[PDB]
Amino acid sequence: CGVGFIANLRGKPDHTLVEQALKALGCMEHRGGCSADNDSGDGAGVMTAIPRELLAQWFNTRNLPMPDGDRLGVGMVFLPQEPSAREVARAYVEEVVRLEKLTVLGWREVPVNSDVLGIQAKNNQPHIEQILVTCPEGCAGDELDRRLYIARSIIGKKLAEDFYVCSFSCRTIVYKGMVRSIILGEFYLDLKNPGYTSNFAVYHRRFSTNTMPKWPLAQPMRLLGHNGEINTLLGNINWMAAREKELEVSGWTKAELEALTPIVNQANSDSYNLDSALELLVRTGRSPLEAAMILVPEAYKNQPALKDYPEISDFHDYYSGLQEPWDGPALLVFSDGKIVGAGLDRNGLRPARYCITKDDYIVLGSEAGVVDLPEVDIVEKGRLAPGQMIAVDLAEQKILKNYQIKQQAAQKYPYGEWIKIQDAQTVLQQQAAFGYTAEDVEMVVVPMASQGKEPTFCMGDDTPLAVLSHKPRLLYDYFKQRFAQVTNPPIDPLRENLVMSLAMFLGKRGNLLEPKAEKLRSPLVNEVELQAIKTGQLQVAEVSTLYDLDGVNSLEDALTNLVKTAIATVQAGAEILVLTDRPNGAILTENQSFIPPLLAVGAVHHHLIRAGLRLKASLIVDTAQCWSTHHFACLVGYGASAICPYLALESVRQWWLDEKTQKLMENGRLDRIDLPTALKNYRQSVEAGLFKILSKMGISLLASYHGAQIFEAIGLGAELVEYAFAGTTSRVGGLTIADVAGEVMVFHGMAFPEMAKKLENFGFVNYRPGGEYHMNSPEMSKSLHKAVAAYYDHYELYRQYLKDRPVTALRDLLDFNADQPAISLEEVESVESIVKRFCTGGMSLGALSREAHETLAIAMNRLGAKSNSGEGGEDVVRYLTLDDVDSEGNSPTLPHLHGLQNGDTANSAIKQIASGRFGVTPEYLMSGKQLEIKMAQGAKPGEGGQLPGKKVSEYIAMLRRSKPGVTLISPPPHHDIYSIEDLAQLIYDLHQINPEAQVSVKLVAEIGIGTIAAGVAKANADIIQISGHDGGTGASPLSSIKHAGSPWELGVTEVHRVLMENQLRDRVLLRADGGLKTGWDVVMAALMGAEEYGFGSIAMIAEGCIMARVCHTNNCPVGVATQQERLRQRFKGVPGQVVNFFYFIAEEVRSLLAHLGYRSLDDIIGRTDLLKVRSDVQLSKTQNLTLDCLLNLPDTKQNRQWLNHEPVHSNGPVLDDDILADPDIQEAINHQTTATKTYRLVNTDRTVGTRLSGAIAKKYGNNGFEGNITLNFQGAAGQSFGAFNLDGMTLHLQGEANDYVGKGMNGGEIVIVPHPQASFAPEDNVIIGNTCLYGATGGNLYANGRAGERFAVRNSVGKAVIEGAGDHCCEYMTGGVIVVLGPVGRNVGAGMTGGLAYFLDEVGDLPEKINPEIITLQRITASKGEEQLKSLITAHVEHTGSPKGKAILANWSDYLGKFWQAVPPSEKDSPEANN
Ligand SMILES: Cc1cc2nc3c(=O)[nH]c(=O)nc-3n(C[C@H](O)[C@H](O)[C@H](O)COP(=O)(O)O)c2cc1C
Ligand code: F3S
Structure with missing residues (x-):
């Protein structure tokens, strides 16, 4: 979107402003989208003062006296086109406008020219009329608007695409439409009439991620133009909506409040919701500036620019307790009619330039050179830094960020006034009960405790999903973190921590609206903070998260009562509920079973909301079953305001207090670890992980992450989700309250009935015989390696292991259901023809040895497919075809490679542009058939690339033009793409420099991708790639490999469906990857919507990876992921092996095309109807999964044209x-x-x-x-x-x-x-x-x-x-x-x-x-x-x-x-x- 305002202080309303407002929308055109028409726009809009002159002629013609400016009042109204329905609609408006003692002078029809609309927008065009109103009692400015506000909100209860009030005030009015920007005035003739004049104008050009315009969604709203993305929406709504019953202010009536009844709603856009919420704050006695500061506060901490202003530091500290920020990037632009101005998200993720003349003629907007002033007279040329507002006030004054914030620092102050004034080894099997595992402590609690940072690992999540595994798992494991992709950016938690906080407020949130005079540093609280708190402000009924056995039979009852106990306890005055698993002291085998802390915290949190009571108390979860960084974030995510992880803390005490450990600390492990440090490290590590997780989504404050539920569940079911986790998506539907019960039993059984010596090891992180399954074992891969190396029995072995496995991903629950007769291999397209669709996928040069990397490029080039340079730059030497190759298979230009022919090239077909821009050079960009914007990667979505210093040889340092020793952690966001338009720009830069190159955008599967891809399609990209959580890495946080991103079956499918529905599917090619290692995998990806297929780890394996899993170490025993010359020398592996591998996979594709019956992969893609749910499979955990999400896609039997793409999109x-x-x-x-x-x-x-x-x-x-x-x-x-x-x-x-x-x-x-x-x-x-x-x-x-x-x-x-x-x-x-x-x-x-x-x-x-x-x-x-x-x-x-x-x-x-x-x-x- 593009946005701005124009203000005129020292003049009376002129037309020029309006003129300039419109010219300015013109320049916003690239910041905006268009529908499938390529013509109707996603919206264009304008707020002005009431063109009281223009309306003058209406009155004249009707022979009627025009009321006072302060007392006229105008509704801009969208009504049904159909006569009969438009009269029903007109009658309602008036019905309610009359219901406040107001009088209707009548309606003005709004001159329009529908002939300039694009076919879609025209088809949808509501009928537009302005209603003109007055108060006979003699109401004015504030009171009238107040009534009109009440009016529009009532009419708002019937809101429909056909029936929407754009604005109803005596002060401002809005002309907005599904037009392209310069068409606005073309459509709305009033705006080209010289009778139209205003002191100001806010304008907005919208950019939507769909193709089906709805006139109400255009956007300057009733009060603000908003350019951005609220990344926390669900939370903000959920809090806001619990405020709804106890609204209470100065003489606003209890039935007048019950009138705005639902002032916010999940089904509307962040913007309609923001505007609403912001509106409420203004109509109840605050100016638009202040209310913005309440909802979208600066980051005030560590800001040396607030030395002189301890007022505002305090007025944030105050509100920080009352109201969580609406996070995400945001340029707001608002006018009251009284005031008008703009301010930024805490982080300043949108541009905002201003311009000021000698006559205080002001011009703000997303872009600098837009309204054309006579430069000889510009006085200031400013911009808003992150947090800053700038404003105008009717009494002829501009107002820079500082006076501003001081002006509600001065009032209602009590700020810094009211603030001030406010032994055995049972442990070894408690541990089993609450689900701890050998690896959980060895591989996670310990590393956190000893080094003070959660563990790092390599490669992808090899094992199957919680709901499909046969091994026991927590409830936490069913929830994958969601993160920011294009739509909005991550922030850097280490480089930009100064902007975050893990503060948490234990008081009950009172009244937002009344500033009455009448606190956890971190969400983690030690036994000390807990004792401390249980003194605190209020007493704090423990609710047993425990329950006895037989008779009071199920987890279903125990849940129920907990809620009732909880509800009941909150009613009776309780302001904090510690839910414990440790009530009155102890956990037994009769206390037989728990309410899992996540399942409880959801329940009490949602049920309380349903009770109309959440704003009453605030929740402490006092649990054992929570040690892992993610664990904590589920908890804060679904309710917990804080956590006392009494057992984790305990498992650190036992570890350090142990002979083995105490011994190694005298030589081996770091004896710089007094128990005080082992623990102060454990938490400091929990904190860094929270910070990280929040940042993955661009969120600064745990306070914002709190209500919000930033996860997508997989395998939870219909009722389970509604009961505990309401409004979280699970498009796959499994676990019942029973089933979760049954799981907690599986490892309750094993601390109690039985015996205790060491917690069990389930090969979760690292392959084991006894344990969890892994697609990539050191054995499967040696057998595949020897198969490729020949030219058989290793496929026996190899495929064998791949039969042998249980269910692992969702495609495994599926099977074919042919719709035409089997056919002969000889009709099918050739191995040569399929292989072009393959991609080797982009592992960095740093990450892999140059031997390993150059080789993939060669085999891929040979097949006439593509490989990909990852984020490492590419050696310029690579861009040249090889002559020097000789009889032995060696060549002077690349002396370390083997088996080269003479047509060979090691240049990468695909060239990656990642957040660090490491090699990114004009010639880089230009040697390249395609260009890839890496938005994110399956191993670690919110995060950015990671290259340990050990691995930064001089070579890598030269290529990356960076320093030889030094670790490389690239930024989470591209500093370039803070939004969809931003994406659009980068693509254009790229198309601009190499018009010949196709441009791809690489996303990770997660709920919302479909909507994002719609936008990427509209942003002129050539290829979208969906990566699953499956994917590999040379180094990522272990929490991330196991917790971020959904499966590619959900990704591809969704992208494929949304694009088809939006009629964009032809605009774009779909590449899918993540765990693809087989013909069958390709066919399934094809049926599901993908046209090209990517391979990392198997290309790797095919070159000689064993699955050591030590990538981040620089030790590959095998020359693949090292920079060490000694190890690189060990690199066996020649282009011919990766070539032959891809020919196998192809062959297996040809045979599947044969059983299915079609000649060409082209004929198969999207024919989801060729899939049925499998007869054999039964899971251990639930009866079944719902697979509608995979099976209900757009018919594709006939409509196949979307499969024809233009060669390269152009910049024009x-x-x-x-x-x-x-x-x-x-x-x-x-x-x-x-x-x-x-x-x-x-x-x-x-x-x-x-x-x-x-x-x-x-x-x-x-x-x-x-x-x-x-x-x-x-x-x-x-x-x-x-x-x-x-x-x-x-x-x-x-x-x-x-x-x-x-x-x-x-x-x-x-x-x-x-x-x-x-x-x-x-x-x-x-x-x-x-x-x-x-x-x-x-x-x-x-x-x-x-x-x-x-x-x-x-x-x-x-x-x-x-x-x-x-x-x-x-x-x-x-x-x-x-x-x-x-x-x-x-x-x-x-x-x-x-x-x-x-x-x-x-x-x-x-x-x-x-x-x-x-x-x-x-x-x-x-x-x-x-x-x-x-x-x-x-x-x-x-x-x-x-x-x-x-x-x-x-x-x-x-x-x-x-x-x-x-x-x-x-x-x-x-x-x-x-x-
Ligand atoms: C060792 C390793 C390093 C990787 N480095 C990158 C990286 O530089 N940039 C990127 O976009 N993807 C990177 N990837 C992911 C690949 O691009 C690809 O998406 C992934 O390997 C596909 O998953 P798969 O291994 O299951 O086939 C890396 C993967 C691995 C195995
Ligand atoms: S797991 Fe990585 S550590 Fe070496 S064995 Fe594969 S390249």
């Missing part, structure tokens, strides 16, 4: 196309020419100069060019200005630019300069957006102006001078030189790992702001430092003329003093930070 006529169209092809082809050109830019002009860069890149790679093409530009530049700039390319910006300047820049220069006619201070005024220089790789950027956040985010070699910045300055920087000449927001060094930066922060406040995890603040001390800093600060001036530049430069000897230099422990010893 683009400015670069003209540039590349004159006398330039000379400066290029004659390797050495100068060329100057000059052009006007408007901010539709995106990615400028990038395609020229590609054109040069393609002919002389990164460095072959000695030309001097200069392109000077003027105006406001679009996203990605100068991206991937080469040497020999210089770009001039007379003007300003937007986000991502110099994204990917490789070489050359970019110079940006306000326009001379400015009269403002450059250094004091913004000139560039967020994420400039992103993964810069060389080149130089100079800019007189501030820049926004993440300046030089992942800079590897780029140099720059700017004059101020937002937060996250130099975020994951790694090399190069950044010079900043003005203030700079906080977190200034997060994970920066090499390179030098020099600030100059004269408020002197810099070290309070800096991130201290790694970089060090020095004062320039070494001369060559000076010399480095000068020539830069000088260059800037020679390219620019900077005033602050020239200043320092002539008083070189003064500013140079306190003026800090940032040194990563790595440039520590270099001629510029030492001597």
